[PDB]
Amino acid sequence: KLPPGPTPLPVIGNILQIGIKDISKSLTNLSKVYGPVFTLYFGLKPIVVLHGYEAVKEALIDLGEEFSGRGIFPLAERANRGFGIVFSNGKKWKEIRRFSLMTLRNFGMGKRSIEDRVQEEARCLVEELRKTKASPCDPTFILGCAPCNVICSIIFHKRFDYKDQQFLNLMEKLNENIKILSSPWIQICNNFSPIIDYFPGTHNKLLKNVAFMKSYILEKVKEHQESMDMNNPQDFIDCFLMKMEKEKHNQPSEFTIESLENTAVDLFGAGTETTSTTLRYALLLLLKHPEVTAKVQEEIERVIGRNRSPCMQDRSHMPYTDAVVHEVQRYIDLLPTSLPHAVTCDIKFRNYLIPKGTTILISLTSVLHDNKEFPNPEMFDPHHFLDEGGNFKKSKYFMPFSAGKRICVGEALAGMELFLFLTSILQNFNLKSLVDPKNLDTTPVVNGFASVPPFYQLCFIPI
Ligand code: HEM
Ligand SMILES: CCCCc1nc(Cl)c(CO)n1Cc1ccc(-c2ccccc2-c2nn[nH]n2)cc1
Ligand SMILES: CCCCc1nc(Cl)c(CO)n1Cc1ccc(-c2ccccc2-c2nn[nH]n2)cc1
Ligand SMILES: CCCCc1nc(Cl)c(CO)n1Cc1ccc(-c2ccccc2-c2nn[nH]n2)cc1
Ligand SMILES: [K+]
């Protein structure tokens, strides 16, 4: 059989029992009734929900391959999103993923490392923060530019100037699509309808935005072709063309110009917003707990001092910082239900039959907020990642990037941006709150499957 669930209604399945507002709260409530594995219907569509470390680890990790499909909804084809990495399945995905993992290796693309692209961005970021002359600031935009720029430098081999028009509207489009894609109407409700697209105009703005981005990418591709150096690949495009001019005899190939721009658009989509929000929420949390910021600053001072840029080598020497960054990710739980999975064939799971192509919802929340692994899991507290001797304490339960065969492609990259951007910020600034710390609220604003910090302002005071 399928795993037990609330018994559906005919046709609207379980829809009107789900708290649409905070899905992860609802999934957790359900697990109190039906335990760690359970089924929900979203309009005939069966969705098995995994809750808790044990359930998640066995699916994602022990049954890795079987749990490796991307769950597909109406929106997947309504915004043409199954032709890059994030929303691909089968051979197309295996190939572009394995390729993309190779290229995004630290030395994956020539003599400039990923570290060096990030280090550069950290200096520019510190610079822009100086330019605000310690005056009150919504860091939203500035923090957003840094991750967007890292993506640009990884793909086109250039960073941009933060005022370069080509950069601003590239971010605008991305920012537009992101905000749209986070509407519950779009993310959810328009998915209760298999056939009729109920937001034509919206899907249109979505795709028009993609086209702008896709066309800009093509310009850079034509430029990369004319200036090709086979022995000197320098970014993601160079690598991709070389994989092409090499698959030329395996026609037709998973690697085409079209799969390139789609992969690029994927990386811009997956690479900016979540990193950007993670930084924005890190600063919020740092303001709220200035003792925490104080300790990071001690670590920076003692390990890196005020001369050079920080660098990834430093992290092994800065367990307290490391614990902070982890604890930020853990606490804010930005993707409460990851992205959706599908099984790749039919399988028995503990005690059930799950049919090839059935949608799987992983509850990351249940893992990040395990109250035995992380006592008081709703308090922000970097001690969740420290031993009683104050060394870094790894946790199997650290899954803000998911786990298994679909684990975030930017795990190592995001981990480097957060460390370098955070340590550079605090090396060069103290953070002044407007309101008093005691009043400021840091609890996540949840909208469906989306988690976001409260609006806030602060000042970046030089040292
Ligand atoms: C804090 C920053 C980030 C977090 C917390 C994060 C988290 C996630 C999560 C939860 C997934 C879905 C995994 C699943 O399907 O089970 C995901 C997928 C992905 N992330 Fe990230 N991500 C971040 C940043 C990045 C960046 C910087 C890149 C740039 C390469 C990136 C590229 C991707 C890609 C390509 C996927 C899709 C993986 C696949 O389906 O094969 N992400 N990320
Ligand atoms: C018809 C083709 C036009 C596509 C389009 N490109 C851009 Cl750009 C605009 C700006 O609104 N638009 C139009 C657009 C119109 C309404 C929406 C919209 C906003 C809020 C709630 C529902 C809708 C919607 N989308 N489709 N029908 N109603 C979104 C985009
Ligand atoms: C100018 C283009 C802006 C980015 C964007 N707009 C569209 Cl539409 C696509 C296709 O999904 N994309 C690419 C896209 C790829 C992956 C995601 C994704 C990656 C990891 C975690 C969540 C997200 C997600 N998907 N939907 N909203 N946010 C977001 C956007
Ligand atoms: C085809 C792409 C899948 C996206 C999607 N469309 C609908 Cl509808 C569903 C609901 O099951 N879902 C599942 C879903 C889960 C998370 C997100 C998301 C987007 C941006 C930032 C965080 C999240 C997130 N991940 N887990 N919970 N919320 C979006 C959709
Ligand atoms: K319309």
Distance CA 420, CA 304 (A): 12
Which of 187, 275, 367, 402 to mutate to test ligand 4, by most ligand atoms within 8 A of the CB atom? 187
Q: Which two tokens stand for residue 400?
A: 């803000």
CB within 8 A of 250, min separation 6: which ones? none
Distance CA 319, CA 384 (A): 12
CA of 15 to the centre of ligand 1 (A): 28
Q: Are 60 and 43 in contact (CB under 8 A)?
A: no
Q: Which residue has its alpha carbon closest to ligand 3 atom 3?
A: 174
Locate the ligand 3 atom nearest the alpha carbon of residue 408 and give its number.
20
CB within 8 A of 59, min separation 6: which ones? 50, 66, 67, 349, 360, 362, 404
How many CA atoms lie within 13 Å of 147's alpha carbon, on the beta-carbon side? 29
Q: Are 342 and 70 in contact (CB under 8 A)?
A: yes
CA of 221 to the centre of ligand 3 (A): 21
Map tokens 């008093």 to a residue.
Answer: 436
Pairing of strands 445-446, 451-452: antiparallel
Q: Are 324 and 386 in contact (CB under 8 A)?
A: no
Locate the ligand 3 atom nearest the alpha carbon of residue 174 and give its number.
3
Q: Are 442 and 284 in contact (CB under 8 A)?
A: yes
Distance CA 393, CA 373 (A): 11
**Is residue 6 exposed (0-12), middle (13-18) or buried (19+ Cβ within 10 Å)?**
middle
Q: Are 452 and 277 in contact (CB under 8 A)?
A: yes
Go through 53-86 and write b for each residue having 16 or more CB atoms within 10 A of its CB, e for each that does not. Answer: bebbbbbbeebeebbbbbbbbbbbebbbbbbbbb
Distance CA 276, CA 139 (A): 10
Model resolution, angstroms: 2.3
Q: Which two tokens stand for residue 255?
A: 């690697």
CB within 8 A of 167, min separation 6: which ones? 145, 148, 149, 152, 160, 161
Among 273, 272, 280, CA closest to 140? 280
Distance CA 167, CA 291 (A): 37
Q: Which residue has its alpha carbon closest to ligand 1 atom 30?
A: 410
- Describe the chain by its helix, strand, coil percentages, rounded to 5: 50, 10, 40
Locate the ligand 1 atom nearest the alpha carbon of residue 362 and give its number.
16
Distance CA 137, CA 297 (A): 21
The CA distances from residue 42 to 34, 48, 215, 281, in Å, are 17, 11, 36, 32
User: In sequence order, what DSSP letters do the residues of 283-348 get, joined into one string?
Assistant: HHHHHH-HHHHHHHHHHHHHHT-SSS---GGGGGG-HHHHHHHHHHHHHH-SSTT-S-EE-SS-EE
Distance CA 410, CA 417 (A): 10
Among 328, 329, 336, CA closest to 19? 336
Q: Are 115 and 106 in contact (CB under 8 A)?
A: yes
Distance CA 174, CA 213 (A): 8
Q: Is the CB of 190 under 6 A from ligand 2?
A: no
Peptide bond preceding 139 in cis form (omega within 30 of 0): no
- Helix, strand, or coil here: 39? strand
The CA distances from residue 159 to 163, 378, 414, in Å, are 12, 38, 17
Q: Which contiguous run of DSSP H or E holds residue 221?
A: helix 200-226
Residues at Cβ < 5 Å from ligand 5 ion: 201
Distance CA 398, CA 326 (A): 8
Locate the ligand 3 atom nearest the alpha carbon of residue 180 and give its number.
27
Q: Is the CB of 177 under 6 A from ligand 2?
A: no
Q: Which two tokens stand for residue 381?
A: 């507290």
Q: Are 320 and 327 in contact (CB under 8 A)?
A: no
Gap sites in the chain (C to N > 2.5 Å), preceding residue numbers = none
CA of 175 to the centre of ligand 2 (A): 16
Q: Which residue has its alpha carbon closest to ligand 1 atom 18?
A: 408
Supply φ then ψ for residue 459, to 5 degrees.
-120, 140
Locate the ligand 4 atom nearest the alpha carbon of residue 42 and give its number.
11
Which of 78, 173, 205, 207 to mutate to test ligand 2, by most ligand atoms within 8 A of the CB atom? 205
Which of 24, 186, 191, 337 to mutate to test ligand 4, by most ligand atoms within 8 A of the CB atom? 337
Q: Is the CB of 208 under 6 A from ligand 2?
A: yes
Distance CA 431, CA 68 (A): 42
CA of 391 to the centre of ligand 5 (A): 57
Distance CA 266, CA 277 (A): 18
Q: Are 271 and 410 in contact (CB under 8 A)?
A: yes
Which ligand number lies closest to the CA of residue 209? 3
Among 429, 412, 186, 399, CA closest to 306? 429
CA of 202 to the centre of ligand 2 (A): 4
State the method.
X-ray
Name the class of domain 1-463.
mainly alpha
CB within 8 A of 58, min separation 6: which ones? 349, 350
Among 376, 367, 289, 369, CA closest to 331? 369
Distance CA 333, CA 23 (A): 13
How many CA atoms lie within 13 Å of 43's alpha carbon, on the beta-carbon side? 10
CA of 71 to the centre of ligand 4 (A): 10
Give the CA angle between residues 424, 426, 428 to the nearest 5°. 70
Map tokens 């779009």 to a residue.
Answer: 186
User: In sequence order, what DSSP letters do the residues of 376-417 get, joined into one string?
Assistant: STTS--GGGGB-TTS-B---TT--TT--STT--TTHHHHHHH
Indicate the domain borders of the chain. Answer: 1-463
Distance CA 287, CA 297 (A): 13
For the chain, the residue count is 463
How crowded is residue 205: how many other Cβ atoms within 10 Å of its Cβ? 15
Confirm whether residue 408 is marked as ligand binding: yes
CA of 201 to the centre of ligand 2 (A): 4
